[PDB]
Amino acid sequence: SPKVTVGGSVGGVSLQARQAQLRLRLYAVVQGRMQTIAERRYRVSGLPLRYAFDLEVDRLEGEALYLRTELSWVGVAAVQASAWQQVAAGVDERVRLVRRDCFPNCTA
Ligand code: NI
């Protein structure tokens, strides 16, 4: 089951030592439906963060892929910053977080 890596770095906000989570969801249209095909969460206290999904090429073949990246604070169930972009396998994909207007004090 040969695999290729969809990976890169997440940056673009300063966490300043605050405990955070990054939730990365990889989307693809699978027979015409937009679906999450993979998800990772990372616990971090600074950026940038290097990420990687190792996915079967059989699963990736022919697919547009989209990466949804969401920063939250640990202890607060709310998105503080996020990114949405098309990505491609085997490419170092730079994810640049965009702060919400309510950052860093967004609420659940
Ligand atoms: Ni950075």
* Resolution stated for this PDB structure, in Å: 1.8
Give me ligand 1 centre to Cα 99, in Å.
13
CA atoms 76, 77, 80, 86: torsion sign = positive
> Cα–Cα distance between 4 and 20 in angstroms, integer?
28
State the distance from the centre of ligand 1 to the C-alpha of 31, rounded, in angstroms. Answer: 36
Domains of the chain (ranges, CATH numbers) = 1-108 (2.60.40.2990)
Q: What are phi and psi of 82, to 5 degrees?
A: -160, 175
CA gyration radius, the chain: 14
The Å distance, Cα 32 to ligand 1 centre, comes to 35
> What is the whole-number distance in angstroms between the Cα of residue 49 and the centre of ligand 1?
8
- What's the CA-to-centroid distance between 46 and ligand 1, angstroms? 9
